[PDB]
Amino acid sequence: MVPGRLFVAIKPYQPQVDGEIPLHRGDRVKVLSIGEGGFWEGSARGHIGWFPAECVEEVQS
């Protein structure tokens, strides 16, 4: 399984690092590249930056 899929933010979070971005429950985050230490790099809410993978989740049917 490789990244680049459509993830959805399940846990809210705010930017606390250079590049990091905010998150909200129900926000469709678009992954672009893997981060560092369980982190991720993508776009969300019209903002491109880094964010914790624990805040995002894969689509569930």
**Interacting residues of 49 by C-beta distance below 8 A, sequence separation 6+:** 15, 19, 20, 21, 41, 43
The CATH homologous superfamily to which domain 1-61 belongs is SH3 Domains (2.30.30.40)
Decide: 48 and 19 in contact? Cβ < 8 Å: no
Contact 31, 59 (CB under 8 A): no
Q: How far is CA 8 from the centre of its chain?
A: 7
Longest dimension (CA), the chain: 35
Q: What residue ranges do the domains of the chain occupy?
A: 1-61
Distance between CA atoms of 6 and 51, rounded to whole angstroms? 14
